[PDB]
Amino acid sequence: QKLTRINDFNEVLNSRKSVKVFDENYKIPREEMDEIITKATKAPSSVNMQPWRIAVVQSDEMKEKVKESFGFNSRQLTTSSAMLIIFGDLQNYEKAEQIYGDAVEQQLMTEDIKAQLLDWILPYYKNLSREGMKDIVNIDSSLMAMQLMLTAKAHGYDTNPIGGFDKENIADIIGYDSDRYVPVLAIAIGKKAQDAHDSVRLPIDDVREFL
Amino acid sequence: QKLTRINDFNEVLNSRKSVKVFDENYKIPREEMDEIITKATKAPSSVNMQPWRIAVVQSDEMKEKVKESFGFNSRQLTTSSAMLIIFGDLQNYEKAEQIYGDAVEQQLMTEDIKAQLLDWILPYYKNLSREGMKDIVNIDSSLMAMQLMLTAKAHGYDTNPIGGFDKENIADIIGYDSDRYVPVLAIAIGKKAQDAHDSVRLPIDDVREFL
Amino acid sequence: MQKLTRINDFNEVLNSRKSVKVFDENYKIPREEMDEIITKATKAPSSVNMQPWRIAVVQSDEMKEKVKESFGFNSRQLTTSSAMLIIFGDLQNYEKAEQIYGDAVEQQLMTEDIKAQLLDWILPYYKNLSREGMKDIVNIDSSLMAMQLMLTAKAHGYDTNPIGGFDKENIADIIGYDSDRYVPVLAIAIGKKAQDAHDSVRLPIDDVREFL
Amino acid sequence: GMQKLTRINDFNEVLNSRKSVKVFDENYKIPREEMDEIITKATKAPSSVNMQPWRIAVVQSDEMKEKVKESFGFNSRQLTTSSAMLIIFGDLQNYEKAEQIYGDAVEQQLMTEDIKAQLLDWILPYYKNLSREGMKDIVNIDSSLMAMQLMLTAKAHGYDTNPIGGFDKENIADIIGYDSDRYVPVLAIAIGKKAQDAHDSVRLPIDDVREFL
Ligand SMILES: Cc1cc2nc3c(=O)[nH]c(=O)nc-3n(C[C@H](O)[C@H](O)[C@H](O)COP(=O)(O)O)c2cc1C
Ligand SMILES: Cc1cc2nc3c(=O)[nH]c(=O)nc-3n(C[C@H](O)[C@H](O)[C@H](O)COP(=O)(O)O)c2cc1C
Ligand SMILES: Cc1cc2nc3c(=O)[nH]c(=O)nc-3n(C[C@H](O)[C@H](O)[C@H](O)COP(=O)(O)O)c2cc1C
Ligand SMILES: Cc1cc2nc3c(=O)[nH]c(=O)nc-3n(C[C@H](O)[C@H](O)[C@H](O)COP(=O)(O)O)c2cc1C
Ligand SMILES: [Ca+2]
Ligand SMILES: [Ca+2]
Ligand SMILES: [Ca+2]
Ligand SMILES: [Ca+2]
Ligand SMILES: [Ca+2]
Numbered sequence: 006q007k008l009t010r011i012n013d014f015n016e017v018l019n020s021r022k023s024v025k026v027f028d029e030n031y032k033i034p035r036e037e038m039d040e041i042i043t044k045a046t047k048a049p050s051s052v053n054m055q056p057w058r059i060a061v062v063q064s065d066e067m068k069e070k071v072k073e074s075f076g077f078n079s080r081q082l083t084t085s086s087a088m089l090i091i092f093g094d095l096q097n098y099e100k101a102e103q104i105y106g107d108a109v110e111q112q113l114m115t116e117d118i119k120a121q122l123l124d125w126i127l128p129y130y131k132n133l134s135r136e137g138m139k140d141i142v143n144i145d146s147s148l149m150a151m152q153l154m155l156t157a158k159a160h161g162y163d164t165n166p167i168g169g170f171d172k173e174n175i176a177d178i179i180g181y182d183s184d185r186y187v188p189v190l191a192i193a194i195g196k197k198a199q200d201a202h203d204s205v206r207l208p209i210d211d212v213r214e215f216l
Numbered sequence: 217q218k219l220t221r222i223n224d225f226n227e228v229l230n231s232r233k234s235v236k237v238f239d240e241n242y243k244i245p246r247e248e249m250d251e252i253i254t255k256a257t258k259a260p261s262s263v264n265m266q267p268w269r270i271a272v273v274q275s276d277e278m279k280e281k282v283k284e285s286f287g288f289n290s291r292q293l294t295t296s297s298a299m300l301i302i303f304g305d306l307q308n309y310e311k312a313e314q315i316y317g318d319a320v321e322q323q324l325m326t327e328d329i330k331a332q333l334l335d336w337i338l339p340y341y342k343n344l345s346r347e348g349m350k351d352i353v354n355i356d357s358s359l360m361a362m363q364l365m366l367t368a369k370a371h372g373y374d375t376n377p378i379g380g381f382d383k384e385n386i387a388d389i390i391g392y393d394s395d396r397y398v399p400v401l402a403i404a405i406g407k408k409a410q411d412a413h414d415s416v417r418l419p420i421d422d423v424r425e426f427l
Numbered sequence: 428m429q430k431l432t433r434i435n436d437f438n439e440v441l442n443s444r445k446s447v448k449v450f451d452e453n454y455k456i457p458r459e460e461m462d463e464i465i466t467k468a469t470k471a472p473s474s475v476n477m478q479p480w481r482i483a484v485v486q487s488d489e490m491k492e493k494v495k496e497s498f499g500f501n502s503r504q505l506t507t508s509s510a511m512l513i514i515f516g517d518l519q520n521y522e523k524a525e526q527i528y529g530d531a532v533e534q535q536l537m538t539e540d541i542k543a544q545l546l547d548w549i550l551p552y553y554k555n556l557s558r559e560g561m562k563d564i565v566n567i568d569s570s571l572m573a574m575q576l577m578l579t580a581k582a583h584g585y586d587t588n589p590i591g592g593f594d595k596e597n598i599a600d601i602i603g604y605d606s607d608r609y610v611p612v613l614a615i616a617i618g619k620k621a622q623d624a625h626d627s628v629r630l631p632i633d634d635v636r637e638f639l
Numbered sequence: 640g641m642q643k644l645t646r647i648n649d650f651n652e653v654l655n656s657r658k659s660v661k662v663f664d665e666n667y668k669i670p671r672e673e674m675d676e677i678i679t680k681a682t683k684a685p686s687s688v689n690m691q692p693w694r695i696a697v698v699q700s701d702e703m704k705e706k707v708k709e710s711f712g713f714n715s716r717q718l719t720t721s722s723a724m725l726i727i728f729g730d731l732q733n734y735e736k737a738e739q740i741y742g743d744a745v746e747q748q749l750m751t752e753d754i755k756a757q758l759l760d761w762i763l764p765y766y767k768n769l770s771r772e773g774m775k776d777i778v779n780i781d782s783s784l785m786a787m788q789l790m791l792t793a794k795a796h797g798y799d800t801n802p803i804g805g806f807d808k809e810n811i812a813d814i815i816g817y818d819s820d821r822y823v824p825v826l827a828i829a830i831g832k833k834a835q836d837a838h839d840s841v842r843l844p845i846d847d848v849r850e851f852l
Contacts, residue, residue, distance in 0.1 A: 046417050046418070059425075061424055061427065103418070114413075139351075143351060144379070151358070151360075205315060209257075216273050397429070472657075472790075486851055536839050566783070567783045567825065577685075579654070602852065629683060635693060638697045638700075639698050
């Protein structure tokens with residue numbers, strides 16, 4: 006099965022499904038993984054603070070270290086080209102200067118406006134509770150995740166989003182500071198070896214209401 | 217006035233930006249809003265439990281009732297064709313029998329599989345802490361939200377995801393049970409009246425690494 | 428979509444206000460909502476706006492346990508209720524006259540001049556009332572508020588049972604209030620119903636009203 | 640005249656607009672059908688052992704207004720201009736209606752005769768042996784509960800009221816022809832169509848009137 010790119014928006018959305026068995030002999034070139042991640046990170050985020058951080062778990066070394074933490078999802082882990090583990094940086098505002106300074110350098114805003122924005126943004130973010138900030142980073146990182154899955158599909162790959170992993174211990178196992186980086190979601194990615202099962206969705210009346 | 221659609225996936229992704237001023241006289245036909253939402257809700261969710269609930273705020277009356285709660289986001293609120301307020305249902309498992317029943321009716325699984333899945337899913341979901349369930353529904357609802365913003369853009373509309381609203385009171389203001397439904401984020405949607413500002417993203421090396 | 432339980436039709440609220448005696452023991456009314464109900468209840472009228480009512484909201488296991496014997500045969504309501512509201516009347520209610528009428532000046536409803544003219548007759552009137560006469564005043568005022576409380580509770584989706592059968596001689600002391608100053612008027616059990624109220628009969632109105 | 644007025648059906652609107660109006664339209668009179676609807680709803684109020692001790696003198700005639708005029712003292716404008724001055728009395732021998740009330744419950748299939756007898760077996764000795772002061776407390780409370788509901792219902796019908804305690808309670812029963820030993824005045828309520836807006840009034844912060852225990 007040739008890798009087959011998909012250019013049509015509706016066809017990408019329609020083909021995005023949870024594949025759970027990938028081709029073990031297919032590895033995604035780094036340059037292509039970086040293109041996919043670059044596209045995903047164009048996602049929006051609260052005050053453009055981009056709190057998402059991705060561990061691209063490709064080696065047998067690291068996969069083996071995290072295998073038990075993935076429990077009944079071991080076969081996605083085993084067969085995938087990579088297991089992407091998406092964390093949220095609870096001190097994401099540490100990059101405010103870099104990010105907003107980049108906007109100034111790229112002539113998207115003046116320094117004057119950068120200072121006026123950051124004068125309210127920084128105290129707001131710094132004063133958030135841990136729980137409030139966890140909510141923020143979970144939401145932003147998930148927005149990026151969805152765009153990642155769609156882009157992966159456009160490139161001809163398939164994914165499986167995964168929450169059934171040990172979120173209490175995963176940062177420690179991989180070596181990230183568990184006080185600062187909270188795991189949000191994992192995404193298995195690769196070339197499909199088995200078709201996804203189709204799934205149902207609720208009737209629209211069960212999920213939206215006009216007011 | 218039929219809007220110009222965007223059929224190419226990459227162009228849709230590249231064109232998704234936060235628009236904050238909409239055409240006040242342009243209202244999205246209900247059939248089209250429902251097509252957008254139907255496409256959005258093909259997003260994945262944990263155990264396919266689809267905890268998202270969208271309040272499509274479009275009337276003068278409800279817009280006026282929620283105006284104070286939107287604070288400095290009044291322009292998006294007033295000019296939008298709709299302000300979508302996305303809640304997560306903390307008791308989303310009450311629809312498990314319905315959803316999984318639908319999967320058997322549509323020949324996607326046999327009843328033995330359905331029963332075995334529910335035998336572990338229900339206890340797990342029913343015994344999660346409020347905070348744990350809040351994490352699940354924030355993540356799922358955000359996945360859906362991203363697909364909604366992209367679909368809206370494919371349709372020629374624009375959006376602005378919004379977090380700066382009174383989440384403590386919003387459920388009560390609109391009449392939803394705040395014990396069951398937590399607000400996740402809002403999305404202003406309509407026909408653009410002012411171009412979005414372009415914005416920067418972090419270099420790839422500051423957001424991902426290979427392990 | 429699961430909504431807040433509200434009854435907004437005025438007649439519907441009055442019609443469904445019935446004495447519920449068995450409540451859902453697991454359901455507790457959030458404080459914000461109790462305060463909203465009490466805020467609306469206290470919009471009731473009172474003689475010279477002196478607002479003599481004082482509400483002990485008995486919700487804790489410890490205080491429930493303490494008042495339990497005082498509630499005698501109303502044990503179903505005390506036990507199962509989200510709260511037992513015990514309404515007292517302040518026989519020295521006029522001690523808040525400067526505060527109350529002061530707030531009216533602050534809120535631009537009357538001038539200080541008018542506040543002084545009013546209090547110049549109201550204070551000697553209230554201060555020279557007998558104990559029994561003041562008890563009549565606070566019983567009436569507190570009952571007016573209590574009815575509006577029960578109606579507002581029903582409008583919020585809750586039910587009530589007004590209760591007079593408790594130990595009024597000792598309840599103030601049990602709760603920690605000065606029995607000389609604060610007289611018990613009535614108690615109101617409040618919560619989410621676990622059993623429908625029994626319906627009750629009313630007299631034909633021509634046995635209780637006449638045109639003169 | 641006697642036009643039926645604009646109703647307020649929203650519970651919060653009714654509660655928010657219930658204020659003491661002291662000047663009514665002197666030429667507006669409330670039709671009996673409407674006053675009776677108002678009283679019918681009001682008497683759905685609860686009362687101790689459902690004994691319903693309230694008795695309403697609906698003073699509407701020029702003749703009876705004149706008779707009670709001096710008894711209303713500085714409340715003369717409310718009396719004069721009102722469609723009616725309601726004077727609510729409490730019956731200190733309210734248990735004389737027990738057989739009727741409880742009998743009606745049996746007739747209406749809300750309880751068995753068997754249960755009615757058991758209830759009255761304790762209720763009657765209890766009520767008949769209360770002190771005069773204890774009974775006055777009961778009837779004041781019950782009648783006040785009904786009075787609040789009457790004022791709200793009146794407002795829902797588009798009318799306004801003014802509760803009034805400043806009248807001659809010592810003599811009012813005798814003046815209108817009620818047995819002053821048996822019937823005690825609780826409060827009066829002026830009712831009519833407003834001719835001037837009520838003054839807005841303040842309430843204490845709730846922290847001064849309630850606490851959680
Ligand atoms: C969760 C979330 C909350 C946001 N809150 C607001 C908001 O309250 N008001 C607003 O104008 N924009 C809000 N934004 C828009 C962001 O500022 C915007 O996405 C970011 O600056 C990137 O710009 P772009 O969306 O044009 O790519 C929010 C975005 C997200 C994802
Ligand atoms: C946040 C999240 C967590 C998930 N967790 C797992 C998981 O641990 N293991 C797994 O096999 N699938 C997992 N799923 C996949 C869902 O079961 C799947 O998305 C859902 O059944 C819908 O099917 P679809 O993705 O093919 O549309 C997860 C999905 C999401 C969004
Ligand atoms: C002042 C007062 C005291 C009451 N005392 C009790 C009581 O001690 N125990 C009880 O079960 N009900 C008590 N009741 C409830 C009455 O029995 C009830 O209101 C009456 O039977 C009418 O029924 P309803 O409230 O359902 O309309 C009391 C009611 C009032 C107004
Ligand atoms: C029991 C009672 C007796 C009252 N007595 C009089 C009275 O004699 N004359 C009068 O003008 N108002 C009287 N008032 C009206 C009060 O002054 C009024 O309710 C209070 O100032 C609150 O204003 P509001 O009713 O507009 O909310 C009485 C009220 C009550 C409840
Ligand atoms: Ca830079
Ligand atoms: Ca500059
Ligand atoms: Ca650390
Ligand atoms: Ca009969
Ligand atoms: Ca029998």
